[PDB]
Amino acid sequence: MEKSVSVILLAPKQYIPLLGQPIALYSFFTFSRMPEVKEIVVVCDPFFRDIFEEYEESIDVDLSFAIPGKERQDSVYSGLQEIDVNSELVCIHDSARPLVNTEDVEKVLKDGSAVGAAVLGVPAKATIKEVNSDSLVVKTKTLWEMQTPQVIKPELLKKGFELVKSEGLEVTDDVSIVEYLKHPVYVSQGSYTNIKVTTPDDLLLAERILS
Amino acid sequence: MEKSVSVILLAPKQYIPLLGQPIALYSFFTFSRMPEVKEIVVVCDPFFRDIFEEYEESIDVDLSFAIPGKERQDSVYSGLQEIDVNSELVCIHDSARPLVNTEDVEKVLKDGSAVGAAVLGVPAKATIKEVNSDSLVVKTKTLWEMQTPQVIKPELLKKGFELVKSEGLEVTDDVSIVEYLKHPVYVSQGSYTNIKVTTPDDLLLAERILS
Ligand SMILES: Oc1c(Br)cc(Br)cc1-c1cc(C(F)(F)F)no1
Ligand SMILES: Oc1c(Br)cc(Br)cc1-c1cc(C(F)(F)F)no1
Ligand SMILES: [K+]
Ligand SMILES: [K+]
Ligand SMILES: [K+]
Ligand SMILES: [K+]
């Protein structure tokens, strides 16, 4: 368990400071303090490499870097190439979610270890309906909003990339490389506080949360 | 079309002022100015009756009142009893959504007239997954977040209430009286700005929208 997890940190709105510190550094430090986390392979444009470099000697993890790709999955694959040969879990996180709780990361790590694949989620508070191509409600289910981390064993993630490669399967917002696997995905119940940061509305909320 | 629609306005966070005016009055006035709207049957506790009474002579609609019930559907039925005998559409709206645009109300009214039942919605921006009782993703759809107005012909709404009455069918968050009808429900594409107001986060966003 200890030093068993590689974080792929996916990292402009993620470098806007929140209560003075850049957004991307909040999750970076949350992961670094966890004894389970062994390395953080950070995915960022070389302009921002220094932003993480500054804190390298203080943190109790291996810092490494990767170049981003066009779409989210390209950046994950890039990060996956630098992880440890003996890492037991990869922990993929969106740097735009600075407020993830250590306790919720612990939960999804534990669930990922047990199941093979787990993602942090919350019950969708809004009333959500399926709508067909004619704009009609498909009438009838517990729907969940998916956050990050996404925690997965590296052999599973690799098999996902290889299946989509070999058969040339299409990949979208809601249908990733791992959606094509028969291997189950567990949904670990997180916190509504683990919001993503895009709008300036999010900062005015996120400061309220941090306090 | 003109003077053809009865609004049931469902109406504490809906009486917190936004840029100085109570939240419930924003939608109230939006509906009152529309030539299609004939009456606003307002659903509120008698303490707040005066809040709408003040503006009665200025508005170009019939103001009426109804007592709320325990759950949302009880308040709708209460409001439904005061509507016009010759009203062609009932337009059910949550007063906690003060920012609905006239143009979007026009759209859902037109769709409700054509289809019999229509609701304002937006594509769900979050990644939403179905999760089973064992907390596993049900792998595979266009999902939409439902707002208000909900626009429906009164005979349809009545038939919904009577079917649930007669058979004693169960009613929840996601399965209303109208979900049990075979009659189609159209989803009119609205605006992401049409947010519901509960948290103080919403006010700090809603003021940004209004400007
Ligand atoms: O789509 C997933 C689900 Br569902 C669960 C878990 Br765990 C991980 C993923 C996931 C997607 C990707 C990306 F490469 F496409 F970005 N990497 O991992
Ligand atoms: O559930 C609906 C859908 Br789906 C569409 C439309 Br249009 C209207 C409704 C609806 C629900 C109710 C309530 F009485 F339960 F509150 N009244 O109308
Ligand atoms: K190092
Ligand atoms: K190692
Ligand atoms: K009147
Ligand atoms: K009348």
Side-chain angles (χ1 to χ4, degrees), chain B residues 156-184:
Chain B
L156 253 34
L157 191 60
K158 287 182 220 295
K159 182 68 191 302
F161 280 114
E162 292 164 8
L163 183 79
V164 165
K165 149 159 251 49
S166 59
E167 296 183 14
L169 291 163
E170 199 66 48
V171 153
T172 60
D173 179 41
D174 302 309
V175 186
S176 81
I177 48 154
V178 355
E179 286 284 309
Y180 286 106
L181 300 169
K182 297 287 181 80
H183 199 95

Side-chain angles (χ1 to χ4, degrees), chain B residues 44-54 63 65-67:
Chain B
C44 65
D45 203 44
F47 184 81
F48 298 101
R49 273 172 173 167
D50 289 335
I51 290 285
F52 303 90
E53 286 287 351
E54 192 180 7
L63 183 50
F65 287 99
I67 307 300

Side-chain angles (χ1 to χ4, degrees), chain B residues 56-57 61-64:
Chain B
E56 187 173 18
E57 300 304 322
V61 289
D62 290 12
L63 183 50
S64 303

Side-chain angles (χ1 to χ4, degrees), chain A residues 126-131 134-137 139-146 173-175 178-179 181 183-187 199-201 204-205 208, chain B residues 126-131 134-137 139-146 173-175 178-179 181 183-187 199-201 204-205 208:
Chain A
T127 306
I128 307 301
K129 305 283 193 188
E130 186 186 339
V131 182
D134 283 347
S135 303
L136 302 177
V137 170
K139 296 185 191 201
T140 175
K141 292 196 175 194
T142 36
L143 301 171
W144 285 64
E145 177 178 350
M146 303 293 94
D173 179 41
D174 302 309
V175 186
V178 355
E179 286 284 309
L181 300 169
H183 199 95
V185 180
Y186 192 84
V187 181
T199 63
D201 140 80
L204 308 177
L205 171 53
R208 201 200 79 205
Chain B
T127 306
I128 307 301
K129 305 283 193 188
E130 186 186 339
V131 182
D134 283 347
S135 303
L136 302 177
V137 170
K139 296 185 191 201
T140 175
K141 292 196 175 194
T142 36
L143 301 171
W144 285 64
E145 177 178 350
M146 303 293 94
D173 179 41
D174 302 309
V175 186
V178 355
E179 286 284 309
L181 300 169
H183 199 95
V185 180
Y186 192 84
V187 181
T199 63
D201 140 80
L204 308 177
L205 171 53
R208 201 200 79 205

